[model samples]
Target chain A: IGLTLQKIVETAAEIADANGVQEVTLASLAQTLGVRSPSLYNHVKGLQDVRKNLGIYGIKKLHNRLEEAAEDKRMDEAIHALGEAYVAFVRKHPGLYEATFLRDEEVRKAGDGIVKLCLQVLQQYGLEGENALHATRGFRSICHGFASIEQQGGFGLPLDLDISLHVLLETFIKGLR
Target chain B: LTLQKIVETAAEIADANGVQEVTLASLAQTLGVRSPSLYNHVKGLQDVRKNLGIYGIKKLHNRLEEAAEDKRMDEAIHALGEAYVAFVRKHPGLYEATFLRDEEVRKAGDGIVKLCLQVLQQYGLEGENALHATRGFRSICHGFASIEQQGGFGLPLDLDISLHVLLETFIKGLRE
Candidate 1:
């Protein structure tokens, strides 16, 4: 509740969700939080630290949301739940989601828990070891593809995207072998 | 051949260092030409990105044509999807500078959009349905490559395995 690192990251992420990741700088965040830039370093190392924290926070939040979405579901149904949850989360939190994929190896490495959730969602598929890892990647790619494209306003046509994605999930489940 | 060669080399550089990293100094030196003389070839980075669009889509068109190869439906579509990932993997930055750029993805005369429609027609999807399918295919292909380039896949599995499964999933979904 006090002004801590978690509070600063949460504040910065809120600003990112309102504006965009590009706007979540130390200066902008400090201005929004009614503090000065130098004071931010007392909590975060810098702007990159803020982004890193946001990435970790977003991944954890996504994993938790998907976990709840997949409860009491299994196999294809679970995969469907998680995939839809991923897209929905991104739609609701585009800037937060973009921060989740900010291209830093260390940051991405912090997503191990999310990866574990992906493997668990596909537990019934018999995907194993390296195959499990690859399927997780496939899942992320498919979900991110739909969500990112939609965010970019890149999809234009008459088909229902949800229906389209549902079919894709089914087909992808078939390929998990 | 000479101009094309220069552009291709520039593309290779972009692939290695990213498009934003390419400048008159680095590009000119890479081409063994003075920065000013290079102007005769490219107006600037925008022009360079434009030509990269031209070159990238031409290559994409070639691969799609070659892979699809008078086939139809899922077979042809899947083949092109494979080529798409391959194209992105090989060209990396070229694919982005060309297809991902706001100025290029559907630039008039790109032919790739029409080509996408051509493939979608196999599914009996025309008009808006065809457009949706086209966008879907591009999203899957481009998004997969983008994540891979950023190392988002982050596992020991080779990307080809991921791409193969993704294309297979898409082609199968098209049938549904």
Candidate 2:
């Protein structure tokens, strides 16, 4: 298409995923796209609007990865797979993960799909209401914690982090059952 | 009351305000000394930040060590979990500073890891499994505190209750 909103957003997301969310500015976006700065105003109002779009895009990408991860899995397998997917998402797109946590209406709306997906997985385990809610939160906390610490080099230990993650996920899944 | 005092003061400033608030000028003002006088004890602002990070990690690890000292098994882990969150709450800016990507800071972090691993070993875990439990426990506590700090748990339920259930379940899993 001819300099569409989707093109602009995809370009911004790439910059964010590569550099950081803080690096996504209108001037930077225009420069990256080889377009004049004024041209971006037609698609996005400003950096805030661009960030809002990125948050939504991040949530959408995360939901897709989660869905794909658990596509052929069930129960414990699905939960473990989804947990891996979240960490993978963070590892691949740290900037996007950062963008996905904004407390906005659009961001929260985009996030509902991921929540619903987790709930679907919980349903396979026959968990619902507060039990499912707690499980989902527990899972997210573990995944987010591992991913954040890993990305920041907070693990510091010489051991294999992948094994640690596998063990942690297995333990959490065990407790949930 | 030299380097130790200066770094401790910096930690207080960071805890009360934020890491960004701990400039040399503010440090001098707080200490009632000339700005250039601080250079006698520390190199510069960056050096001060590095010291602050080390201090924060050491202090947090000490608090955790005390929290788990007289407890055992599920109780020890629960105590450590509560203490970790308490440290984060009391010194959020200092806690942020501890994530510094410095060798010394990273090495200091191992103290917390060692203490946690000790608790797992005491709980009858060993070798690779003990390492795994230590990692799992750290992830659960850190993740819970981080998500809560960012307002991720916005549900109507009480967060304290959620924390108890989460820790209890994880400890139960380890026992199995």
Candidate 3:
């Protein structure tokens, strides 16, 4: 297959995961792909392009996973599944997930529809407008927090992560009900 | 130059600049000593970060202990939860150091482990179960503050209130 924009981003993600985000520069990507630095322009604008593209790829991947979890699932069940899926996704793609907000610009974070599915779950579950939004944030923060902490080695104690995650999902879903 | 003093100075620099691009040159100049002197007291950058992580945990342990003073599991966890968020908001530098990467931080958390269990025990949670509660508490506080620090909770929303609400939500879970 010819080198497409998507392939460039996937390669960037691979580098970021293997090395670190800082190592995913235009020069590195060019060298890794055995192409001239200038030749990369046809696929990506520059390093910034790679960074933004990496972020977009990550968000789409996460959003798709979340959507699949939402399908044929009830309210609290859906939220619980979504939370676990979110953390698992982050764990599997730590570097790419970190890249999503490489610029810290939330505007390009995700398509609005990315949140729509969660909103429908919350509202249809009987959560009011503000409550639904806050609940949405709750899911995001909890999942993000767990995954970030685990990745950061902040858990400290020796225990099965699955048990901790189980109690957390149970606790949060119970609170939602 | 005591190790504590070196780490303290580094922490101060971190708080001042979010710890971004902090290095020997930046820390040594700020400490009025040559970078080589730092090597005498500290191994290198990684060692400094590890020391800084321990320092942060103790500092946070102190704050949470104060929050839990005379309060039991229910009320104390809420108080400490608030303390956790406040500390994260107050010292971005220290917060950054407390959690750097895998393994090192787990060993560094020895100081706060008891404090976490002390409060978890009040919830009738003990042993390995206490560890579960501790992790949950951490996830909420760290999650809220991390997002807030990263501008995760942006615009019109009160970051303070958001943390407060999340803390309450977790506390309620323990109650159940």
Candidate 4:
């Protein structure tokens, strides 16, 4: 009966999750929403508008999830759990994660929260300044790379990915200490 | 020029800018030809992107092969990770294009996996362990490249050192 920005962006993200982000054309969104193109345009101006909104949506969700993931943790256990939380979030909301890849300043600003969270975790290890920053960057890269590869079926081998992720995160955490 | 030249020009545009910059309009302008005249060499932008994907995959394969050759174990893995990240940094546009789900890209990608397996085999890893390690290796290297390109690493730290730490950590992880 009615449309809103949240609805439009949510629908687009749904498509992004089910398929890849590449599949989220305006026509596809309209069809998925059971509305005409003009009706959809009433909420967002164009596909890029929806994309940016979807990106921000994903970023905010990711920030919240990461913060929650590290809420009650400390040191090695905390960092390892945080890593798992990140990979899980990306797997569950892959479309949203893809949206987070936007180069827009606004989207990046929202993502800075996640960076701050990572920095705080690294600080627990007595890392300061550039060391903390490097560890934070390393943490982000390892999780993102693992998730991206898993999503693309890059880990189609026989061994369990859970074990591999555990091993990967443990490796990073060990290196940090 | 031939289709190869057209693709080469497109690659330059992609490398200079981003892959998103390689439109038919821009391609025509860059090549000093009218839009329709350019169609004689390729079907459209999709065809151009596919060609670029194959080109990227093959070039990257060569780089990895060269980096891994004459090196063994840790030395080879370090060189491979460095080479992979360098390829992505140097050619972000072409690297992005290489993800096309085309069969040619897959075949070219296999060469890369095989090269990695050769290096991992020296670690006494075979069968599923080798495959698992390879996945981790690709993930770490790809993660570094993608995140760095997207400006995800914003702090004033050296990316090279960070990469070295990751590669070394991963290799050390493999040992145990």
Clashes of each: 0, 0, 0, 0
Q: Clashes in model 3: which pairs?
A: none
Cα deviation of A81 in candidate 3 (Å)? 1.8
Lowest lDDT sum, 10 consecutive residues, model 4 chain A, at A150-159
lDDT per residue (tens digit) for residues B68-129 in model 4? 88999989999999999999989888888888777676666888888888788887853467
Which lDDT value does model 4 have at B140?
90
Give me the runs in candidate 2 sitting further than 4 Å from their true place.
none
For model 1, what is the alpha-carbon lDDT of residue B76? 78
Q: What CAPRI grade goes to candidate 1?
A: acceptable
Q: Show the lowest summed lDDT stretch of 10 residues, model 2 chain A.
A: A168-177
Which DockQ-derived CAPRI band holds candidate 4?
A: acceptable
lDDT string for model 2 (A1-177, tens) is 589778888998899889998898998898999999889989888888888898999899999999999998998788778988999999999998999887777987888888788878877767878878877777788999999989888876667988999888877767777
How good is model 1 by TM-score?
0.77
Candidates by lDDT, descending order:
2, 4, 3, 1
lDDT of 2 at B34: 90
Candidate 3 lDDT by residue in tens digits, B33-124? 88898988888988888888788877888998888899986688778888988898889998888776635655657767678777787777
- For model 2, residues B63-147, the per-residue Cα lDDT tens digits are 9989998898889988999999888877898999998888888888888888888888876764688887777888898899998
Q: After superposition, how far is residue A27 of candidate 4 from its true place, in Å?
A: 9.4
Note the chain A TM-score of all models in turn.
0.92, 0.94, 0.90, 0.91
> How does residue B13 of candidate 1 score in lDDT?
84
Model 1 chain B poorest ten-residue lDDT run:
B101-110
Model 4 stretches with alpha carbons more than 4 Å out: A1-53, A124-126, B1-10, B13-51, B124-127
